[PDB]
Amino acid sequence: PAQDNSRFVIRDRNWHPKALTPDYKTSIARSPRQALVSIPQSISETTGPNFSHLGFGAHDHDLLLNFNNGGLPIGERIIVAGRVVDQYGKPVPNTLVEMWQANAGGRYRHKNDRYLAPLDPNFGGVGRCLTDSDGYYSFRTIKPGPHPWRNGPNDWRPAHIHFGISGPSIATKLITQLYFEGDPLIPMCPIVKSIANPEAVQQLIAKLDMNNANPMDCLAYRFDIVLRGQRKTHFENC
Amino acid sequence: PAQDNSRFVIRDRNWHPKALTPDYKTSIARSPRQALVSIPQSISETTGPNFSHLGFGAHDHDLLLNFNNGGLPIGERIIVAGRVVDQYGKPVPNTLVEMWQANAGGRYRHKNDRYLAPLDPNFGGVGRCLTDSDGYYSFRTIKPGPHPWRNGPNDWRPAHIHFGISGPSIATKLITQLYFEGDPLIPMCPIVKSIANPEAVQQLIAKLDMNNANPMDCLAYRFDIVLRGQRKTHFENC
Amino acid sequence: PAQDNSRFVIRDRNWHPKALTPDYKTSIARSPRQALVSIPQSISETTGPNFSHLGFGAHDHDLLLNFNNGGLPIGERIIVAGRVVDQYGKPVPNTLVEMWQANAGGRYRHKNDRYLAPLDPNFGGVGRCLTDSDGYYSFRTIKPGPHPWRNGPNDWRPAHIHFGISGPSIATKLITQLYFEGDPLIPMCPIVKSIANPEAVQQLIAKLDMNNANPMDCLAYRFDIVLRGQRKTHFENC
Amino acid sequence: PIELLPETPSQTAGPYVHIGLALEAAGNPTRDQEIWNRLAKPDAPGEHILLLGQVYDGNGHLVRDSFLEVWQADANGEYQDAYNLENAFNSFGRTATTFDAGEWTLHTVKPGVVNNAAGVPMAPHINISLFARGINIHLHTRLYFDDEAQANAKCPVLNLIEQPQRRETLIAKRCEVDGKTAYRFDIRIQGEGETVFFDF
Amino acid sequence: PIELLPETPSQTAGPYVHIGLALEAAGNPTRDQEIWNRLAKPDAPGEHILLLGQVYDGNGHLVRDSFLEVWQADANGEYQDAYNLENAFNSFGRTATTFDAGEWTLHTVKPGVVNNAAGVPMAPHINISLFARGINIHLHTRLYFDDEAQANAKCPVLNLIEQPQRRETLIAKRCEVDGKTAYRFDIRIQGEGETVFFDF
Amino acid sequence: PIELLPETPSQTAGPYVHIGLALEAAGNPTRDQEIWNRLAKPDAPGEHILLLGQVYDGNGHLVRDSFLEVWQADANGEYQDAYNLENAFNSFGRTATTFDAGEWTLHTVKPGVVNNAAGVPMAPHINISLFARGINIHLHTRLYFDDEAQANAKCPVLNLIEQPQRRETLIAKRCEVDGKTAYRFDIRIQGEGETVFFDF
Amino acid sequence: PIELLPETPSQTAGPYVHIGLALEAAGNPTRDQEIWNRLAKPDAPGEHILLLGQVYDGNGHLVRDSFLEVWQADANGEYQDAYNLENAFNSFGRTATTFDAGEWTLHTVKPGVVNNAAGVPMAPHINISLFARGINIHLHTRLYFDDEAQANAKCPVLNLIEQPQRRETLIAKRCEVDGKTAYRFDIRIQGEGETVFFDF
Ligand SMILES: [Cl-]
């Protein structure tokens, strides 16, 4: 079983996006109006699943091969890699990183997406990876395309990859989005801008990583993830 | 009996904290949602109690002695002094200044304060003082400790002393909080930060006042209060 | 037995306070007037006591409990923690850190302290801690109050905690004082200002460390210590 | 334009207000002289009334830690500013809600009519200022009386409330409590039936 | 003061969350191993229960694209972090609301009792994280049980909710579904009966 | 050029050093294990000696609040770093001057000869560090023995003191105190007969 | 912190101080009224005394251009601030050292006892401010009397001087000059027997 022997740095909820961010229209009716109730951390909050023994398929991290229906997907071949650390700089090893994204034309393989850009018969758009003993993960994929959506009358998501990271506890678990260096859709996006602090937004922007590219093959982007800092309990019930 | 003979500069309700300031959680459900109704000033608003003839005990302004149970309170001995003026810079003589605070450990002597830092048997936490004919008041006390509170999961009040000042009318009556120079908790407090203007926050910070200190005895802090400007009526009902 | 196997970076005696610093009056008659005599480092200078096997009591590092006379001390509950490293940035494991301080009111429990702020029956003022295998130490205490002293006619120590750190040799042994972030007494103290470089003074200021605080319980301050750099001998007697 | 010194900004009175401002309520020993909820000694001129009320947040829940300050004319419609516990009557008082029932009480006389600055009579009223944890600057309101319909209908201050329906939030409800004339004045800080609050 | 690396900021999970996290519900093929809504195989120890609920927005309308992650103790009150689809019991699971009825289900056992950090027993509960389009950072809540009324009344987490009426929002209602103990736990994100959400 | 992290700067130990570092002296209760002035248990090898001395400021007045730390080889000229109050001998000790007489005392053995880094024997010596109110960084010195004239004459550390007259400030004076071998080592911080202080 | 107007900084009185402050001693004509060295007319109450002293620099050499201002209580221990050359007694006076012998004199009465601010009796004393070329800010000292040994031993100001030997520097020596009680008070600005100077 799991034990309560750690504490996690309290979240800065003005660094994160707030609940009510009206320019992102769906958040209006889907945001609480009451204050969140602060509770102290107990074993319920400071523990969480470890996926070391989840069975991973050989292509789970590789979106160029995990939806093979006779060929390679069309689009910019890229590696997406990085390190998952906590706020103290400590690697987060053997942690689950999941990702999902649209195809090269901004079309999602989801029954609810009727955008007129076509599906790619060799692209599904889901991956997962356990971090290594040093906190590293990597994916191989196609760079996604921007996506129009029914928010404002001419709103377009920047190219983006959705990420889900478990970390060591249910307190550290995070869902976020990766954006791409220099994309001029980024400052126009009301989802991006649900984050008030521009320095926070910068933290979501993956950087072109030529050092990690395969020549004549695929480019590479770096996306590092910082989860809440973990420390030992001290001077508790004494 | 009191007369209608003066008008008070209208409040700047963007200088004062707004009613709704959600990081201060309790304000969410205790802020009106309708606009305040502006009314002209009449004798009802422009008069107020004069406390010159209230009977003040010898130690009402001295917290080192007003709760004597056979010793001195523990903690940093301080004079808290200043002047009450209005916005025109005019002194406010013979006005009621009241104050209340936690002990040295951040413990309030109030049944609903269950913070685990102990009470101090020689410390109550309450004082009052009428300003003298030139607008000056002073207290002697112990510097209050920071106090944790159930807002966010790791929120702490800066050291603070609550103040209530009557002034010449119910229009000028004010409750506020004094903070102390250099306290690094100040910028992190959602009660302080209910004030949107940083220059307004500065008006609440008492300054270390070495010139007013008793050597080998007690330090001193200076806290001046500005109440609404009072002017004569002019050109009314003509 | 100890061996001569290391050399320590020479002190910068313009970084440390000079011997003669006349605003600190007691230094006038207790500073040598002849130059120090430089001697090369030998086994006498490059070894020192290891305190791993000294017997530490359960509360030697906890001032909230190491002077228990039937209650908790009054004042602001705090963790004082940090790391001991050398100038190369190398951790100093299993080293002796000792500390002593006044109570919440600036009163020292010492027969020659006759300051009129009362003693606290549950507060002694002394702690010790061996650094762990990664260089970390921590104490739990009450934040000391400022203390007036007979130097100039209105001089007050900032709140401070005295520190002694053994390190790997008598060459590294150091006594210093910790001060607290934002304390406006700091720039006015002739003991602080015995240090001529303002950047040296900054190295003595503990920082409020919210991430290390126990919510609803105690705050925390971070104080890291840098001891002389230790290197191997090289090219000696050849 | 002309800028004066800025007013010292407001802060919440906080949950422990009572200890500085309502000593009994905190669990605290009182001093010899306290500013409290008895505005009229038994021998004051005018009609002796008990005032009571409860305070509700925007979720309909009792505000048990609120503190009220009141200012009113005597029966003759004059404001008595020389505060003194020897006086038959004081125009100023303080009260607070109990940590159980959440009810405050005031012992006073019905105020006489007072004119506005233009000479227009206002309906009899008690000026109220409301303080509490979560209230960053105090809320101003007025307590009028349901047995003064004629005067209320003509009050130049009530007539400044654009919607008539909102005027009713300021009208205290007459009853009897143990044979004495009483009025209930509930305050709703937020939402359905929100009490009118003033700026002046 | 001490400043650490800033946490990577949250973003909405988005409407297509099912693509990466609920593969069936998206309409896509599943991999051989999936994290889903069966925390207990028939052979697991404890009382086997069905959980179900719907999720409402501020207008009273179903959230048909929401995604829930849960974390609960086994029947002994111990958290099982070694996630494995070979286990009879996993402490963690995932479920989603159908785009049709808007209802999620979970197949699990009732959790045993867990103490808080101070050693006070918490009523049996399931920790829930709610994700969806329009939800910028996930909402944390707890599902407690209406057949644990006496434990719930002593829970030190429930007692941190200041108003007793808001605690009700966390209490799942017991029923029977096809001969199995079941509880309904509906979530109201905003407005009348808004579900209590936690920060920790 | 290469700059490393700067050393944490020194500060005075201050007048109340004893309370953290010499608990008896302050008027304070001691803990079970203390670092003090008995370096050798009665059964340690070597010649058992009492060391004593007083400390003078630049006006010739006693420094009653000084604190000394000492480091020395055992009789065999080896440094015993594994500090342990069970040990027959420890190479480290602490002492202090009484608030009356101003005299400190150490109970130890005469140290054996130790070689410098070049292999040259140094005369028997005790390394001393002196702390006090008004001393901003501690003063390093050495205690040599007047009955080791041959060795002293040849010490590569004593020979680094340019003036011979100053070497004599480091030579402790042999006596007997109640039949036991003793040496007096007075320190003059400043002025006539100023003790040699070292930098290393 | 609070910063006030800064005090106008001191400068030396300079060698020609006698021009403005000691008109005779300069060699210049005096005005009709001069502040000088007779604090008592023959008719003043108390023991009449002559005071004299010389002033030495750090080399043991006379300061022949020094100027002293004194302030003392009358024989009853009361300070007389209403300066008037018609008074039998003034609490204030001025004197200077002759360019020839280097000696100053004052004609006064022995001051009575004055309590400190805490009500503890101070031994009889004269407050002195010393001015001269080379003295950038004046030096404050006190002249106490050797026929007050027992009072001097209890003086709370003398007892602030940490070393008993330095207190001696403040004790004037009683003699007889032409049949009058006299005391010598020499001042040594620097070095061996340096006179205690105060800050207040
Ligand atoms: Cl496979």
Ligand SMILES: [Cl-]
């Ligand atoms: Cl690995």
Ligand SMILES: [Cl-]
């Ligand atoms: Cl001002």
Ligand SMILES: [Cl-]
């Ligand atoms: Cl560091």
Ligand SMILES: [Cl-]
């Ligand atoms: Cl309850």
Ligand SMILES: [Cl-]
């Ligand atoms: Cl003495």
Ligand SMILES: [Fe+3]
């Ligand atoms: Fe407070």
Ligand SMILES: [Fe+3]
């Ligand atoms: Fe998306």
Ligand SMILES: [Fe+3]
């Ligand atoms: Fe100190």
Ligand SMILES: [Fe+3]
């Ligand atoms: Fe000149």
